[PDB]
Amino acid sequence: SLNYEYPYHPSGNPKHIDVSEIDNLTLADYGWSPDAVKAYMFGIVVQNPDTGQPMGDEFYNHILERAVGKAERALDISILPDTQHEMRDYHETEFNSYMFVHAYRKPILQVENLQLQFNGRPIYKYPANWWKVEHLAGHVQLFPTAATFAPQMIRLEYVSGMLPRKKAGRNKPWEMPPELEQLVIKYALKEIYQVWGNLIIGAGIANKTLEVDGITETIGTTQSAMYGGASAQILQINEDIKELLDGLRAYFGYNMIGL
Amino acid sequence: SLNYEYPYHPSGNPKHIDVSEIDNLTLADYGWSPDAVKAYMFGIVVQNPDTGQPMGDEFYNHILERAVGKAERALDISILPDTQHEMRDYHETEFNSYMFVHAYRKPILQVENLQLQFNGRPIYKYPANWWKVEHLAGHVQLFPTAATFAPQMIRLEYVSGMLPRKKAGRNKPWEMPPELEQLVIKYALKEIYQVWGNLIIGAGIANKTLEVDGITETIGTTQSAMYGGASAQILQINEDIKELLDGLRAYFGYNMIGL
Amino acid sequence: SLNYEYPYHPSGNPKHIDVSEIDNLTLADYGWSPDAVKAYMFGIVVQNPDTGQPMGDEFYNHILERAVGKAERALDISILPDTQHEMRDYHETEFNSYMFVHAYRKPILQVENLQLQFNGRPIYKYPANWWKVEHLAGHVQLFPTAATFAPQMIRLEYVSGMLPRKKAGRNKPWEMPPELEQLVIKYALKEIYQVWGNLIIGAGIANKTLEVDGITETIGTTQSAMYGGASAQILQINEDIKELLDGLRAYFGYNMIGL
Amino acid sequence: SGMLPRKKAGRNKPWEMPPELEQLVIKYALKEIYQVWGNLIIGAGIANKTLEVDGITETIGTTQSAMYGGASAQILQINEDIKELLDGLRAYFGYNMIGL
Amino acid sequence: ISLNPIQDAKPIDDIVDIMTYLKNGKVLRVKQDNQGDILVRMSPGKHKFTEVSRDLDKESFYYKRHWVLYNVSVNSLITFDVYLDEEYSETTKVKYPKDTIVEYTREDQEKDVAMIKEILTDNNGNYFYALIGETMLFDENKLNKVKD
Amino acid sequence: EKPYMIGANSNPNVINKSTTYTTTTQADEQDKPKYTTRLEFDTIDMIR
């Protein structure tokens, strides 16, 4: 005997998240707070040159929401926890392969429903114990126990995202690795530095020197006719991302589809 | 006759660590204290120019935690000790080959359970003496004594990571090499130098000269429109890592999978 | 007749080291002392710029332990004396070849035990005189006198390392060559120069000149926006290593495995 | 195994150390020395300087540079000599062959 | 559910005790108003003299404190408040130390003045203050220090 | 064990900060040094 919620079987598709908690989980749980960005800019402050206004936290939150999205497309991933309503077609070769299915999004924390439909009406519902999931790769397969294709023959509902990691320096396949936490931070700093680069001195100024009654003040800056003030840091950031992003890709691997 | 904890057979899969001690092991045990990073920066201190306030070890540990993850992805390895609950599929060709298995994460310190199940009911649990492991390569094979594939037929539980090195200048395959200590530290320095380079003098400043009442000073800094102040150290660190990582990749070798 | 400890036969596998002395042998016996590093930096002293603190010997010992390890991976070697517990698989082609075996580590100073096991239990033990060793290449072969493969059919225990060389300008194959002693030194200087390079003047400073009441002091340094202060020595060190390392590789030769 | 010290001037037997190895080893030692000696010529990490006090001034421009060391010139020449010396000497011994 | 009381570093007021510690060889720590915070030690061995260092930290295995001779002055010791190294530390940089007089808000919406007599911190680092004439403990944000 | 996270800021605001004036005193002090390179003439060459 075994005790479990009927949709969730500990073997195959163990539960990982409560559906109600999906809304609650947010950026701060993953450490993507404005404080994190500012810490990476320790000693540096972004401020208006003509007045003492600093840029608000909302701007950082505004940037952070886009940075994750850009990373969410740079890697074909669904990172934040969300629920999906998926219809998938029937194909003979995949159906005979234990009903192999490749989710549009990944990873799959857990699967809620799995049904076959006809004329838009569900006609069959498999036992919960039958079907099993592969979280990281997003594969879903059916393991029954005791023309060639059609459109939207089946319905799938599942949760996609990554849990905020529980322990240091480790992560389960259904759990967020540290790199993704850092990668989104790095993306954001690219936009921050762009804005900040124009504020160090005036606008489009490279060389300056004053002379007053024998007193002279002189400054030369990183701003140049061909490079921006923050281009150096941007260049280093891109260098870090190229190594980091490529290394992270191996964690997921290349896509593939039959034909 | 032989005396041993039943899961742990001294021949084949000798015990190396207790399950409870996993939670105890941390970064400091491996030598990744903030002191080590500061030692590599001997004679150099980073401070916020608007204060007399340096940064705390919280930032350093945050860097180190992300840094060890970075090396954890540069190589397809799990480094810190952790337990794993793996469901693996049945493939005929490897099944006949002494039930050959390659684990998701490596190295394997020890194996606790190895069972074959159908629908959550263990069909067959093997004797402890039969199964053997290959720690570094992560290979698991069986030595019994007196369609072509299916999903998640077997269930595996084991521990993944490396132990802190015990003896000086020596290491076992189940033991953290000293190199990973240096590689992770070097990764942390890359993040630090990005911060430290900006704070050496002002921000966005390359050249300056000031003259008052007969006393004058002129300075030309490493900061430039095309390169950052710390770019020199980053270049050297990248050079060292490339040699260090490529050579270390020989210790683990390439990854292969059939089809 | 002949007198010898049973495991050690003067012909084939002569004894070279006492097992008890393994722990005693250390870095100083091989000349890898901090004094050696400082001698290679004759006239140069590493010191904090703001206070008169020199870096301690432990830092050099900390560096030296990693430098040997990096060399221990740059060449697939076990250099320090240590004892190994090795299980190896059975393969038909190698078994018929006088039971050819290629050790994971090399060189092999001496072999302690060699047994065939079944079900995790040893069942046979060859006579000591039968088996013979090839120290440098690490080959072990059996020379008896008067499916196709299985996993971990045999057990091997042997000592791996290199003796501290007894005489000047010479070394036995089981004895440390002078080059390895120098190579580890060269690796360490790479890390020392990195730290020292930031201490010559300030931080990220290239050009300076003062002027006070007609007195002026002016300095230009090796530090530059694109190169570090010690990059020149680092470059020369790399040049020395490339010739030295490649020449040392010929002493060991390329690896090979059948298939 | 080894070679004897050379007995007669400008002559050598196959079992006798050629004079070249004497020079080659010496040249290798100079490479290590010049690495040390280059750093100590003036201060450390210094390339250019000028000092002026009370009407007396001095200015110096050294071989030390951000891209090359002070002794790099000698190392370059030594490397050039060794390359000719070693490659030519490799003819005296020839390539290595083994059957299979 | 809090950490035990944390003690403040006592400045040494009398010269005689300071010399006595110095003769024994126990390290002193002096703050100079103009230049810096320094350690003071009398040399080990028979070659006796005063030594000064600026390596302000506990002697870790990886942090070797370095000493140089200096002719320390008596007046420097007298005028500048001096501490023993074993007490002065980052372990407590409390905003209002012990024996400090503060103005604190009472329940009756009256601001009374009281002296801090005991100090302890919760696990979260917030310092709890015991005040004369009051039973419970007080929080840093509630307090006000009146200077001069 | 638990992951290291940056957390929130802690520095409180300060308004109307007064500059620091060095205090006059007859007592002794120690001048904090800087250890670095030094410039000198080549007096031997000057003789030449």
**Interatomic CA distance for residues E23 and B143, integer angstroms:** 74
Distances (CA, A) of A137 to A17, A106, B15, C86, C226: 19, 7, 32, 36, 44
Please tell me which of the candidates C62, C120, C227 has its beta carbon nearest to residue B12.
C120
User: Chain B partners of F7 at a C-beta cutoff of 8 Å?
Assistant: 58
Classify residue A112 by burial, with Cβ atoms within 10 Å: 0-12, 13-18, 19+: middle
Determine whether the interchain pair D43/F41 forms a contact, defined as Cβ–Cβ distance below 8 Å: no
Close Cβ partners of C138 (under 8 Å, ≥ 6 residues apart): C102, C103, C105, C106, C107, C108
Determine whether the interchain pair B39/E60 forms a contact, defined as Cβ–Cβ distance below 8 Å: no
After which residues, if any, is chain C broken (C to N > 2.5 Å)?
A: 146
Determine whether the interchain pair F4/B26 forms a contact, defined as Cβ–Cβ distance below 8 Å: no
User: Chain F partners of E143 at a C-beta cutoff of 8 Å?
Assistant: none
Strands C149-160 and C82-91: antiparallel
**Interatomic CA distance for residues A219 and A210, integer angstroms:** 9
**Three-state DSSP class for residue C69:** helix
Determine whether the interchain pair F37/D51 forms a contact, defined as Cβ–Cβ distance below 8 Å: no
User: Chain C partners of D52 at a C-beta cutoff of 8 Å?
Assistant: 214-216
**Alpha-carbon dihedral sign for residues B221, B222, B223, B224:** positive
The annotation status of C102 as a binding-site residue, yes or no, is: yes
User: Chain E partners of B51 at a C-beta cutoff of 8 Å?
Assistant: none
**Three-state DSSP class for residue B46:** coil
Q: Residue C30 carries which side chain, given as an amino acid letter?
A: Y
**Interatomic CA distance for residues A73 and C20, integer angstroms:** 60
Q: Residues 5..44 of F with a Cβ closer than 8 Å to A: which? A: 5-9
Neighbours of C174 (CB within 10 A): 19
**Interatomic CA distance for residues B186 and B188, integer angstroms:** 5
Helices (H), chain B: 21-24, 34-40, 57-74, 92-96, 178-198, 231-252
Whether A233 contacts A190, CB under 8 Å = no
**Interatomic CA distance for residues C113 and C117, integer angstroms:** 12
Tokens at C229, concatenated = 């202060």
Whether A229 contacts B204, CB under 8 Å = yes
Please provide the distance, in angstroms rounded to a whole number, between the alpha carbons at the two ends of chain E: 36
User: Chain B partners of C231 at a C-beta cutoff of 8 Å?
Assistant: 232, 236
Q: If residue A86 lies in a helix (H) or strand (E), which one and from where to where?
A: strand A82-91
Please tell me which of the candidates D35, D52, D69 has its beta carbon nearest to residue C216.
D52
Please tell me which of the candidates C218, C222, C230 has its beta carbon nearest to residue D50.
C218
**Interatomic CA distance for residues A113 and A101, integer angstroms:** 14
Whether B72 contacts B27, CB under 8 Å = no
**Interatomic CA distance for residues E52 and D20, integer angstroms:** 58
Determine whether the interchain pair D58/F42 forms a contact, defined as Cβ–Cβ distance below 8 Å: yes
**Interatomic CA distance for residues F1 and A102, integer angstroms:** 35
Tokens at B17, concatenated = 């660590």
**Interatomic CA distance for residues C119 and F4, integer angstroms:** 47
User: Chain D partners of F39 at a C-beta cutoff of 8 Å?
Assistant: 49, 51
Mutate which of A27, A32, A35, A41 to disrupt the F interface (most F C-beta within 10 Å)? A35
- Dihedral angle over CA of E80, E29, C203, B215, nearest 10: 20
**Three-state DSSP class for residue C17:** coil
Chains D and E touching, counted as 3 or more CB pairs less than 8 Å apart: no
Q: How far is B144 from chain A (nearest CA, A)?
A: 26
Whether B163 contacts B17, CB under 8 Å = yes
Chains C and D touching, counted as 3 or more CB pairs less than 8 Å apart: yes
Determine whether the interchain pair B62/F5 forms a contact, defined as Cβ–Cβ distance below 8 Å: yes
D47 close contact with C: CB closer than 8 A: yes
Resolution in A: 4.3
Mutate which of E53, E56, E63, E66 to disrupt the C interface (most C C-beta within 10 Å)? E66
Computed on alpha carbons and rounded to an integer, the radius of gyration of chain B in Å comes to 25
**Interatomic CA distance for residues A219 and A64, integer angstroms:** 34
Strands B205-212 and B215-221: antiparallel
Tokens at B93, concatenated = 């060709």
Strands E111-121 and E101-105: antiparallel
Mutate which of C179, C236, C240 to disrupt the D interface (most D C-beta within 10 Å)? C236
Chain pair A-B, CB pairs under 8 angstroms? 151
**Interatomic CA distance for residues D88 and D21, integer angstroms:** 12
Q: Please name the residue that has the structure tokens 């140089």.
A: E68
Tokens at C193, concatenated = 């120069």
Cis previous bond, B107, omega within 30: yes
Neighbours of F19 (CB within 10 A): 4
**Three-state DSSP class for residue C133:** strand
**Alpha-carbon dihedral sign for residues C97, C99, C104, C106:** negative
C97 close contact with B: CB closer than 8 A: no
Among chain C residues, the shortest Cα distance to F33 is held by: C50
Beta strands in B43-142 (DSSP E): 82-91, 101-102, 108-117, 122-125, 131-133, 139-142
- The full DSSP string for E85-112 is TTT-STT---SS-TT-EEEEE-TTS-EE
Quote the crossing angle between the two packed helices D72-93 and D19-39, to the nearest 10°: 160
User: Chain F partners of A168 at a C-beta cutoff of 8 Å?
Assistant: 1-4
Please tell me which of the candidates F35, F37, F39 has its beta carbon nearest to residue C47.
F35
C195 close contact with B: CB closer than 8 A: yes
Q: How far is F17 from chain B (nearest CA, A)?
A: 12
Computed on alpha carbons and rounded to an integer, the radius of gyration of chain F in Å comes to 25
**Interatomic CA distance for residues B196 and A47, integer angstroms:** 20
Mutate which of A29, A33, A42 to disrupt the F interface (most F C-beta within 10 Å)? A33
Q: Please name the residue that has the structure tokens 């000149």.
A: C209
Chains that touch F (3 or more CB pairs under 8 A): A, B, C, D, E
User: Chain B partners of E62 at a C-beta cutoff of 8 Å?
Assistant: 35, 39
**Interatomic CA distance for residues B56 and A16, integer angstroms:** 35
Q: How far is D74 from chain F (nearest CA, A)?
A: 24
User: Chain B partners of C120 at a C-beta cutoff of 8 Å?
Assistant: 9, 11-12, 129, 132
Chains that touch D (3 or more CB pairs under 8 A): C, F
- Residue of C23, C63, C30, C67 lying closest to C46 (CA atoms): C63
Please tell me which of the candidates C216, C229, C240 has its beta carbon nearest to residue D45.
C229
Neighbours of B189 (CB within 10 A): 23
Computed on alpha carbons and rounded to an integer, the radius of gyration of chain E in Å comes to 19
Phi first, then psi: what are they for B230, rounded to 5°? -90, 5
Distances (CA, A) of A94 to A148, A162, E96: 11, 27, 73
Among chain D residues, the shortest Cα distance to F39 is held by: D51
Please tell me which of the candidates F1, F2, F7 has its beta carbon nearest to residue A35.
F7
